[PDB]
Amino acid sequence: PINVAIFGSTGSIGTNALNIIRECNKIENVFNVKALYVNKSVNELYEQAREFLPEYLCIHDKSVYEELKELVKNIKDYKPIILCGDEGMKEICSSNSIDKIVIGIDSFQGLYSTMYAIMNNKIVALANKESIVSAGFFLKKLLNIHKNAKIIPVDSEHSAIFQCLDNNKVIKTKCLQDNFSKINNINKIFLCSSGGPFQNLTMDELKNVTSENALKHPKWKMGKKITIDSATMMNKGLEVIETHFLFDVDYNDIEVIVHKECIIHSCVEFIDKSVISQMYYPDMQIPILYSLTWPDRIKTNLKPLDLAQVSTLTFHKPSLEHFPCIKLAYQAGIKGNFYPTVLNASNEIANNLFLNNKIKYFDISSIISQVLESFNSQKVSENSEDLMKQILQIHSWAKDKATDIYNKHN
Amino acid sequence: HHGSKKPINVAIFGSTGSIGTNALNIIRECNKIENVFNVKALYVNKSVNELYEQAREFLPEYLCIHDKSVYEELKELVKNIKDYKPIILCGDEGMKEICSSNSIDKIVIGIDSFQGLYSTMYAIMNNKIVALANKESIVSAGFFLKKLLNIHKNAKIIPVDSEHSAIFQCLDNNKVIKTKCLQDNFSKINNINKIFLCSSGGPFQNLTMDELKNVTSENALKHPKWKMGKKITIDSATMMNKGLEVIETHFLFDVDYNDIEVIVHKECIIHSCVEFIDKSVISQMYYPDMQIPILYSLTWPDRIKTNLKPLDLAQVSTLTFHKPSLEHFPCIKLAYQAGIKGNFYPTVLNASNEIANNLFLNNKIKYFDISSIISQVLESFNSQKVSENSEDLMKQILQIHSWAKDKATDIYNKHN
């Protein structure tokens, strides 16, 4: 059986992880949900605890610790280990009764648990792309020390690229490892995108778009943060960098492609020019499941893809003029160093400002552009400990700088 | 990263045809990047002059002409070529001697129709890697080849047919190594749940039933993109090619018929898709060009660099998929019925189609007469006990094949 832990179990990813796990278990008892971890959603967590009965429960907000223990106490025949915050998170990561950990925690915050899951040589099903954009080089170093740890991508596009690769070569290397794309004969990557809701707007129409126009979609809900990045397409920009680090693919070899039907989740072009792609309805259950079964696949009762029904699939190149955040991602990525870290931190700020109606669409990229321009490359620390505090320091600085540029009312 | 060349010894059967030309085309091109392919033998039927030109360029250790009438003429032309002493052979004999060479590893089978089955069975008998393009040898001898491959455990059949190359390319080779094509449980070991078999649809895809009745071989032989043999080109028009590929899929990957869906994709970019048990679908795509599937069958389990134009999805812009009308392409229905019936129906199916296809090509019968004649031959045939040992099974297959073609001819005569 596969002993899994779900970090950010109450979120979009966490819930979909639990859904797909619940269904597969009806066919055969393969997954054992050993630990659930969230920030402050104590009631929802309590509901999940009741169903799955994980040996471990962890709430990051220590101020709702008693409430949690008080609710859980109402579940008959159940004596789980209830922990709190960082220490609680680290306690779960070091347990020997846990093999894989799904990181469904959003934002920079997700980096901490990703880091500890790796330090404990676990298999990390990573959905939190911010961890790889702000600490890509750091995660690669960390993975070179804890050689049994692995980062299996959950982000649908990267899961797609991962699935397209021949596992006979994948097994001979590992995500984030040097020469990954060379060992897999990777020539180029077609990074597919839904295009977001503003994809067909003219410049004048984009100028006045709002966060209310961009948030709601109809296949499944996602966090507000990622929903907004999807709108500005900064999501795909962050995903370009994530692709670079995860598969050691050069930036001039990643092509963003807008595929509005979202059936083809991404394609991989090999050195002979043949192209392999992964496809299915826009659902996160597949990428999450594959991250937990790889290198194997298991039966599910998901609705089969009906191509005749879908009938049409379209492709076009995004306009960098309308979606300038994509260009900024490439530039920060190509500059390397801590620019990707600055890009992400300043976007967290610009993103939230837009969400809360504080700035307009183009102010988002402008703010981010200015922070990237202000930052000066720093010598990359030699050991992980210092490199970590450096990433944190630069992250905080980029955010204060973004806020500052904004505070001058731009 | 460098030119650490470890050459691949290859033989090209049917080197002067569509597959053979495309084969040498890609070998020639990849060798300009890093000399990795060494053609040890070429083998044609009657095209002695074109074979001559190929020998001059590739200088293969072996040369073979199947028709004895041009054997001497071949030995003549080759004389000119200086500093070249190849072993010129002829007929079946020359083909068996080539398959038995120890200097050859991979044999590309580009021989058309039923004839391709002979060299196919002999390549397997010599434990060679068979980059099989000839689908007929698989439809009419599927379970024979299966038994043959269980005896010659080192022999392997790598598919060159585009759709089937696509499916194969979508698999994890760490699972494929535990088995091999045309072996029971291939789909289970690879967790294959279902196959989407793509088709160009052919030239009659938008014609009405009344229009179809009067279409001709001339209208079917004008495929706007590249050159292929006349049989397959007609088979593509009636979509019997796809029906044959349905059975080919069943035998190559052990996929149930009710798990094979024929889909019409006119852009011909997505060459086929593989649905795994989790419902995830992986597909192989590129411009419709036989060079990739051919090249892949010779590089597997690896891939090598090429200078082929890169697929440009943006330019392509649109991809369409739709169910094929069984009313307009009844040949598809017949293929499924024969495959599902098992035993020797596929053999009867392929044989009667060969007759029906040729009759149409020479404007002797009409579009719906093809589907009708095959239907009659199939209903006329009755199961037969499957022979245990391969030699007798091979006879039985040759017997049923000849019986089927003869039957189809009778029906044509009683009608004319």
Ligand SMILES: NC(=O)C1=CN([C@@H]2O[C@H](COP(=O)(O)OP(=O)(O)OC[C@H]3O[C@@H](n4cnc5c(N)ncnc54)[C@H](OP(=O)(O)O)[C@@H]3O)[C@@H](O)[C@H]2O)C=CC1
């Ligand atoms: N949703 C999607 O389809 C996709 C998401 N992703 C990525 O996956 C990540 C998560 O996304 P998503 O599920 O949408 O986000 P959500 O906002 O829906 O959920 C975030 C989850 O993380 C938890 N969390 C927040 N802070 C902490 C903390 N300090 N300690 C423990 N848990 C915490 C939340 O708990 P609480 O409920 O208590 O607040 C919540 O369960 C993001 O990095 C995103 O970019 C990538 C591809 C697709």
Ligand SMILES: NC(=O)C1=CN([C@@H]2O[C@H](COP(=O)(O)OP(=O)(O)OC[C@H]3O[C@@H](n4cnc5c(N)ncnc54)[C@H](OP(=O)(O)O)[C@@H]3O)[C@@H](O)[C@H]2O)C=CC1
């Ligand atoms: N062409 C294509 O794009 C595709 C073809 N295929 C399959 O590949 C096979 C070949 O097709 P294609 O190339 O179109 O056919 P062609 O008619 O173009 O070529 C047939 C080749 O086989 C040779 N040949 C015929 N009989 C013999 C024999 N007895 N001994 C040695 N060689 C012989 C011919 O030699 P000669 O020139 O001397 O007559 C010729 O080189 C078919 O089974 C087809 O279904 C599958 C997918 C795509």
Ligand SMILES: CC(=O)N(O)CC[C@H](c1ccncc1)P(=O)(O)O
């Ligand atoms: C589903 C997923 O992996 N995402 O990263 C959400 C991103 C957006 C998305 C939305 C719907 N389907 C696919 C992707 P986009 O950034 O617009 O491509």
Ligand SMILES: CC(=O)N(O)CC[C@H](c1ccncc1)P(=O)(O)O
């Ligand atoms: C390219 C190939 O492998 N074929 O078998 C030719 C098949 C025909 C074809 C023609 C043109 N392009 C692709 C396929 P169709 O049967 O119409 O799909």
Ligand SMILES: [Cl-]
């Ligand atoms: Cl598998």
Ligand SMILES: [Mn+2]
């Ligand atoms: Mn994504």
Ligand SMILES: [Mn+2]
């Ligand atoms: Mn794969």
Ligand SMILES: [Mn+2]
């Ligand atoms: Mn400066």
Ligand SMILES: [Mn+2]
């Ligand atoms: Mn084909």
